[PDB]
UniProtKB/Swiss-Prot annotation:
Binding-site residues for heme 3, renumbered to this chain: 27, 82, 85-86
GO biological processes: anaerobic respiration
Functional description taken from the UniProt entry: Exchanges electrons specifically with the basic cytochrome c3.
Name the record gives this protein: Acidic cytochrome c3
First-to-last residue of the parent protein present: 26 to 127 of 127
A GO MF label: electron transfer activity
Protein localization: Periplasm
Originating organism: Desulfocurvibacter africanus
């Protein structure tokens, strides 16, 4: 994903919002994220593997559009991951129009 400049949107069908800006490799370098499983996680039987990751599997392979149990639907997965870290670190966009950029 070194060519990535927005988050993939094909799983959603018709969009309400602009694609979310996300230059994956530059993002992750500026943010200081050193583990891939900060996002590409592996959750098994309610427990998060600390030493594994799911790189190479789309989020949308596990996260349906609808919530399943405590597995978030796909929109909420992205909002909880992305907007959740920004809020926890007090850095990064936290308005709709700073990710979903109209341009
Ligand atoms: C850690 C260094 C890391 C790697 C390696 C990695 C790889 C990776 C690949 C190969 C893809 C698929 C790209 C494609 O389809 O061409 C991908 C996709 C996404 N990633 Fe990633 N990624 C690493 C780390 C991070 C981190 C720390 C985050 C969150 C900040 C992140 C997130 C994403 C997202 C979102 C995508 C798109 C998912 C999809 O549905 O295809 N990755 N990454
Ligand atoms: C792709 C980068 C991706 C995103 C985004 C994502 C988000 C995410 C969130 C925010 C949660 C809630 C719990 C937490 O904050 O970790 C969550 C939950 C689970 N996920 Fe996920 N997830 C992404 C990727 C994937 C992939 C590729 C898988 C399947 C291999 C997967 C699985 C799950 C499961 C299962 C859960 C529920 C865990 C639990 O509470 O039992 N996720 N996802
Ligand atoms: C989830 C896929 C995700 C998105 C989308 C995302 C976007 C995003 C943007 C657009 C920025 C601003 C870039 C700019 O300067 O123009 C930004 C910045 C930060 N992010 Fe982020 N972000 C996503 C996920 C994550 C996660 C999971 C983390 C923490 C683990 C995270 C962290 C940060 C940090 C820190 C920054 C600020 C970088 C800086 O300017 O110092 N983001 N993100
Ligand atoms: C502000 C509260 C806000 C809204 C509103 C919003 C909407 C939203 C929707 C409706 C989707 C589903 C796809 C669609 O367009 O129909 C969606 C998807 C994603 N979002 Fe979002 N979102 C708002 C806030 C934010 C912020 C602050 C971020 C960046 C941290 C962000 C990110 C994302 C991501 C990633 C996705 C999935 C990929 C894509 O649709 O772009 N949202 N959002
Ligand atoms: As680089
Ligand atoms: As929140
Ligand atoms: As809070
Ligand atoms: Zn753009
Ligand atoms: Zn560099
Ligand atoms: Zn790995
Ligand atoms: Zn909050």
């Amino acid at each position: 994903x070194e060519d990535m400049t927005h988050v993939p949107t094909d799983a959603f069908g018709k969009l309400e919002r602009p694609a979310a800006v996300f230059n994956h490799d530059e993002h992750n370098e500026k943010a200081g994220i050193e583990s891939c499983n900060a996002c590409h996680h592996v959750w098994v039987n309610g427990v998060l593997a600390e030493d594994e990751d799911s790189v190479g599997t789309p989020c949308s392979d596990c996260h349906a559009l609808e919530q399943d149990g405590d597995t978030p639907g796909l929109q909420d997965a992205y909002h909880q991951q992305c907007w959740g870290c920004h809020e926890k670190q007090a850095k990064g966009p936290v308005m709709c129009g700073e990710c979903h950029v109209k341009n």
